[PDB]
From TrEMBL, chain B:
<feature type="transmembrane region" description="Helical">
    <location>
        <begin position="134"/>
        <end position="164"/>
    </location>
</feature>
<comment type="subunit">
    <text>V-ATPase is a heteromultimeric enzyme made up of two complexes: the ATP-hydrolytic V1 complex and the proton translocation V0 complex. The V1 complex consists of three catalytic AB heterodimers that form a heterohexamer, three peripheral stalks each consisting of EG heterodimers, one central rotor including subunits D and F, and the regulatory subunits C and H. The proton translocation complex V0 consists of the proton transport subunit a, a ring of proteolipid subunits c9c'', rotary subunit d, subunits e and f, and the accessory subunits ATP6AP1/Ac45 and ATP6AP2/PRR. Interacts with IFITM3.</text>
</comment>
<dbReference type="InterPro" id="IPR000245">
    <property type="entry name" value="ATPase_proteolipid_csu"/>
</dbReference>
<dbReference type="Pfam" id="PF00137">
    <property type="entry name" value="ATP-synt_C"/>
</dbReference>
<feature type="transmembrane region" description="Helical">
    <location>
        <begin position="6"/>
        <end position="28"/>
    </location>
</feature>
<dbReference type="GO" id="GO:0030665">
    <property type="term" value="C:clathrin-coated vesicle membrane"/>
</dbReference>
<keyword id="KW-0472">Membrane</keyword>
<dbReference type="GO" id="GO:0046961">
    <property type="term" value="F:proton-transporting ATPase activity, rotational mechanism"/>
</dbReference>
<protein>
    <recommendedName>
        <fullName>V-type proton ATPase 21 kDa proteolipid subunit c''</fullName>
    </recommendedName>
</protein>
<feature type="transmembrane region" description="Helical">
    <location>
        <begin position="171"/>
        <end position="195"/>
    </location>
</feature>
<keyword id="KW-0813">Transport</keyword>
<feature type="transmembrane region" description="Helical">
    <location>
        <begin position="90"/>
        <end position="114"/>
    </location>
</feature>
<keyword id="KW-0375">Hydrogen ion transport</keyword>
<dbReference type="GO" id="GO:0033179">
    <property type="term" value="C:proton-transporting V-type ATPase, V0 domain"/>
</dbReference>
<keyword id="KW-0406">Ion transport</keyword>
<feature type="transmembrane region" description="Helical">
    <location>
        <begin position="48"/>
        <end position="69"/>
    </location>
</feature>
<keyword id="KW-0812">Transmembrane</keyword>
Length: 204, 203, 150, 51, 150, 150, 150, 150, 150, 150, 150, 150
């Protein structure tokens, strides 16, 4: 079992884990998993945390022949609606040899007491396309069995994990409201049809 | 009996299962899920709207259709011994169709309002578009169901009037007043649906 | 600012205020007009007295309408969840209490007119018991005003 | 497990869940309704019940 | 501090307090009024006495109103969730207990009117049985007042 | 850009238009034809006058066919949810209206054919009532053409 | 510390303790009163002895009141959740046992009165039979007290 | 790119096209065959003349078969959801329309054949009315052919 | 530490033990009461023998109580989820086994009593039949103790 | 390589191919069998002619087996979801079309056989109707063979 | 490692083994008792002989009890899900098979006694028919014993 | 490698195989047994022939037992999910097919035995029809053996 990445300040404040972590540039993929998880030598230069905000900086020397850095970027906010401190990973950033690229992660969210997990966080549609891009990109990312927590951590273990979209989805709900509505009409129609009758007699 | 019991079973089972789920996600602390917020937000406002428009027509048409045959059946059945009924008592059908008219009026008015957002993020969609989709659903539902009930009532009372005429012609003119009190309910449905519609804009 | 979906409950309020009241007034009017028609064939003179249950059913449709108007002219995209729920509660309270009043108006507006066809003395009694139906619409209205204006 | 890792649900588990539920529901309802029909059907052998 | 959604339950309480009481008072009225009409043809003189069940059904509508008003006047834009639940419970507990008394006054009122018409001695005993119906609404009011004020 | 699920709603629209109209027209036909069967024993000459509700029910199926074909020709892979929900709404609108119109035609036919058989004067009265039942079908068609071209 | 929803199960206990008990007592009253009304036609004298089932229906609503009050007086925002589930268990256990009692009191309180009208000697039997109905509510109360006070 | 599970809706189309058309054909056949058997005891010469409703019912099942085979030959591993929904809508449309046509065929076949037993002149009218029934299968088939080829 | 929801299933145990046993005891008493009352008129001397099925229905409620007490006395906030499911099991086991016994006892304790007045030799047979009913409650108790104590 | 749950849909297909065909054949056999039992008392000779409905109900069960076995022989752990869903569609296609066939067979065989009791000449007509019922299973089979051989 | 709730399915097995077996024995007893009661009036000589279906209803309850106890004694907090599910399957396997036997025993226990009182020779064949009912419980028990172990 | 939450399906197979077969055998037994009992009053000599349908109901229960025990012997901790679903499908397939056969046997056994009271020749037709009913259970077993060993 791979040990998580952990960011520590007196105690662990951010915990991050995956079954795979991989990236591409110019669509050429590389595997970072064994270069990242359980690597005590992993460079975390510029990693930072606050109760409102988290920046898990990950740094690597050989990728695409150069030094490469990632920021996984998160916030905690109280919402009066629910009256909880929710959290989200709103975005990722890639800092290159001389430029920056980013992904509008969005769906990674939950209450701050729970970690989040997903089978895939990726740009690819076969893997859900959670890494939303408003511009064309030479970069790509995929996390497999992604799991994260960045607030209310306790010990070198996650708290309980909220799923991404396990039991229902938007298209499913809209589909069902339509389907159940037309199935109600079908029942009404069919009830009248099953109520059809014929005579047992005729006039003289 | 049996075909109702099969449906009743599904109906009770549905609510029983919701009670089980409601307890389950509460007691397991998973009650942060199924927050009505995401359901009422990730659903497209156009879905709510178009259901609204289609309800406004179709429920009015159902109310009117029941309206029609309920009185018509009596017009015909009394008409065998009292052929005079048909020409005058047909005004009940006209009021049942007026309930359908109230439908098509409100539906066409609602149908002018919707336009594309060019957006998919709830914040880029913004409050006006959600409020419109809901208000349009509400309006179309309001007129639709109000008319549904209105038309059935008009059909019922108009049948009564037709069978009164079959015994004495003078009864029709007197009794006919109740068809107004029926029809007014459909107009009230329209009035509310206009007001629910009155602030909407989309895109 | 307030959440985007906030206004949905208040929209369902205005609709429930009207729709359930329509169901009530329609049922009341149907049962009443049925009772009138069936009476009238025997006692043509009694219609102008016997119409009253239909008028009372219309007053339930008015109770729905008034609350629905008040909600509809109060609704906005900016509405706080609290006032949105109040509008829902009001709409259900008048709409469903109105439906209940319509059920009672319909039952008595029938049975009472049929009785009156046989025995004119019933008329005073029928009005008294019918007032104790229509007033539930007024109690629905009272709660709906109190909630929706809070 | 040593780090409190998640239950490992798949992507589109909600598709799978609904497919299993609605298909098992449609299967069960078709079995139940057919079973209720054949259970409560009338053989109409009255000509023997009278003798 | 409190959840903005949280006034929903107290509002459903205010609604429920009226609505289910109204469904009760309506059913009780409706049943009794049918009975009165079907009795009156034989015994018109009994109307002014045999009306009582309808009045008691009216009391249930009042018990609803009391709690509905009380909850509504107790609501606030940021209400404590615990207070919102207390109000829900008050609302159901009067509302449905009033439904139960409405059922009881209905059945007893209809049957007891026919009984009185066929034996006038019943009327004095019927009142006791009707109080034993109507008090269920009052016990529901007692709890609903307790919860709302606790 | 547009979701891969997007076209599904307009598909269900085209289905519902044809299906619910076929259901309404079938019921209309079934009732009317049952009436013809009974009538023809006494009035065998009257069949080709009395068949009107049967063709009218077929025309309600055609109203759904028109909308269904129009939606079906209007579908595509890359369709916006906007056009997809417009087409869904059209499908449901004509569909449930086609049930309703076809049902009224059936019941009015089952009556009107038998009424005409005993009283020839009713024949035009039946046809007028049926024309109103068909106009309800037109309202479902008209909205559906409007939304399908929007 | 304690969960926000914790008091919800407590108050639903208190409500349930009343509601189901009122439904029980209502049914018990309604059935018995109908029988009493029917019997009194040929029995102007038995009325005062015949009311006994109605009173036994009334105490069921009071058993509900006991628990409903006990729970209500032991609610607080800070409630330990375990206390809330104890209170839920109590409120259901009296509430639904009182419902069951009310069903038995109703059927007995009809049939026993009718039998007593046919044969006065049944009275003692009906007393004993009715005790074995009303004791259900008492058993509901016993456990509901153990639970609420645990 | 296409998602996983994508063939489901399209093959539900294929199955539904066959299945619901066969159910329509079955009801059509069952009621028709009943009416034929009862008629034929009095009129054996009409046996072969009266099979046509059963033939039309077989044609409804064939319309389902046609769409079902056309979908079944066009389904592929990793198909687009667009074609899968088109195939769903096509198969639902013909299948569920075939139910409607089946009920009309069954009802008009039963009533028509037993009326024809009493009066031979009904046979012409019955067949025309059954054309107005059976054509609903063609209308469903038309929409289904259109949808499955977009 | 143990999950704080775990006491919920434990109280559902105690409640189910009581509630369902009361539902059984109610239906056993209600049917028996109808039986005894309907029977009494022809053979009034039989009441003191004929009460016995009611006593057995009472015993079913006692079996529920014994479990519900033992569960309630064993609960704690810290309760291990294992024990809580055992208690749910015990509660359903006795409670629904009591409900089953009450259905038997009701049907037997009606029909057997109505037989017994026509033929007194049946009485010993009715007792023997009822032993095989009341024992179901005992089997429920046996399992419920075996679960809840381990 | 391929996902988990792979076989589940195809397994439900195999079961469905059997079960729904067996339900169809059971209804067919049952209903027609009762008509044979009734007929045999009036017509000692016709028993061995009248079995053909029941033979064809057996054929429907064989059609179910044919597909169910073909699906079952085609299942594996690594199966593509494509064939698994096709096999579901196949098993439903034969199973429910065979249900339709068997339902039709039951009715037409009963009515035909009771008709042949009164008039033996009906047998040729019954066979033609039975062919038009049985072929619904063949159509379901055709689609199912495509949706399992593809 | 196992989930905290692992023992849930196992205890639900134990419950089901008792509950559904009790329902089985109840229905079996109820129908048998009514049968005995109805016939014993005419044929009191048969009463001791007539009990047998009730005895077999007891046997079903015992088969339930055996599995329930075997599960309950096999059940513990530390149970693996494999053994837990096996115990659920066992508990259902006997429980519903016993319910099936209870339906069977009940119907045959009524009809068999009714015939036997008219014709004493039925008593031999009746018992054989009941053996073929009771064995259903035994088959369910056989499976349940196996699944309860490994 | 293999997940847990997985042996559940094969276990549900084992249960269902027995249970639905027991239900099949139960309806088969209960219907036929009522027929035998009624028949025997006038024709006791026919009992030892007329038992056969009840014996055939035993065969369904044996088929269910065989598959259930076969699945039970095939289950293991951490079973491959593919096999778990196959065992579900087998158990449903035999069980529900045995239910279908059960109903058919019960209906044809009843009507057959009754008719045989008037017509001894019906025994031949009855055995053929019973073979055509029972073979559905055999077909269910065949596919269930295939699935249980795939």
């Amino acid at each position: 079992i791979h040990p998580p990445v952990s960011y520590n300040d007196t105690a662990p404040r951010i915990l991050f884990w995956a079954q795979n972590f991989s990236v591409a540039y110019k669509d050429e993929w590389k595997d970072l998993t064994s270069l990242t998880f359980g690597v005590e030598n992993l460079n975390l230069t510029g990693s930072f945390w606050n109760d409102s905000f988290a920046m898990l900086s990950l740094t690597y020397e050989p990728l695409f022949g150069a030094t490469v850095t990632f920021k996984f970027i998160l916030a905690s906010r109280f919402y009066p609606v629910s009256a909880r401190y929710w959290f989200t990973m709103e975005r990722l950033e890639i800092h290159s040899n001389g430029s920056v690229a980013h992904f509008n992660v969005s769906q990674v969210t939950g209450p701050s007491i729970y970690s989040f997990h997903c089978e895939y966080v990726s740009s690819l549609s076969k893997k859900g396309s959670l890494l939303v891009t408003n511009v064309p990109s030479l970069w790509q990312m995929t996390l497999h069995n992604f799991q994260i927590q960045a607030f209310n951590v306790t010990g070198e273990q996650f708290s309980y994990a909220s799923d991404c979209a396990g039991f229902f989805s938007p298209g499913i709900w809209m589909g069902l409201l339509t389907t159940l509505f037309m199935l109600f009409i079908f029942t009404y129609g069919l009830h009248m049809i099953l109520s059809l009758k014929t005579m047992d007699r005729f006039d003289d | 009996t049996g075909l109702e019991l099969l449906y009743l079973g599904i109906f009770v089972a549905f609510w029983a299962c919701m009670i089980v789920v409601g307890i389950c996600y509460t007691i397991f602390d998973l009650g942060f899920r199924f927050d009505v917020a995401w359901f009422l937000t990730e659903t497209s406002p156009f879905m709510w709207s178009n259901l609204g428009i289609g309800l406004a027509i179709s429920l009015s048409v159902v109310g009117a259709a029941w309206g029609i045959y309920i009185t018509g059946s009596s017009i015909i059945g009394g008409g065998v011994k009292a052929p005079r009924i048909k020409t005058k008592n047909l005004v009940s059908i006209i009021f049942c169709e007026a309930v359908a008219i109230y439908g098509i009026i409100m539906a066409i008015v609602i149908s002018n309002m919707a336009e594309p957002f060019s957006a998919t993020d709830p914040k880029a969609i913004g409050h006006r578009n959600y409020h419109a989709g809901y208000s349009m659903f509400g309006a179309g539902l309001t007129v639709g169901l109000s008319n549904l009930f209105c038309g059935v009532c008009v059909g019922i009372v108009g049948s009564g009037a037709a069978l009164a005429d079959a015994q004495n012609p003078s009864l029709f003119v007197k009794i006919l007043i109740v068809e107004i009190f029926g029809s007014a309910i459909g107009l009230f449905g329209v009035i509310v649906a206009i007001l629910q519609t009155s602030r909407v804009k989309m895109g | 600012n307030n959440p985007e979906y906030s206004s949905f409950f208040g929209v369902m309020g205005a609709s429930s205020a009207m729709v359930f009241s329509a169901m009530g007034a329609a049922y009341g009017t149907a049962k009443s007009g049925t009772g009138i028609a069936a009476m009238s064939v025997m006692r043509p003179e009694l219609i102008m007295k016997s119409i009253i249950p239909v008028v009372m059913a219309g007053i339930i449709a008015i109770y729905g309408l008034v609350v629905a108007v008040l909600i509809a002219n109060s609704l906005t995209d900016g509405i706080t969840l609290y006032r949105s729920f109040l509008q829902l509660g009001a709409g259900l309270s008048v709409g469903l209490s109105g439906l209940a009043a319509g059920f009672a108006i319909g039952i008595v507006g029938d049975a009472g007119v049929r009785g009156t066809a046989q025995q004119p003395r019933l008329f005073v009694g029928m009005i008294l018991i019918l007032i104790f139906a229509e007033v539930l619409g007024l109690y629905g209205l009272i709660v709906a005003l109190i909630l929706s204006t809070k | 497990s040593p780090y409190n890792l998640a239950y490992k649900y798949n992507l589109e588990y909600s598709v799978v869940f609904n497919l299993v539920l609605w298909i098992m529901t449609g299967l069960a309802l078709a079995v139940i309704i057919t079973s209720y029909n054949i259970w409560n059907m009338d053989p109409g052998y009255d000509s023997i019940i009278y003798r």
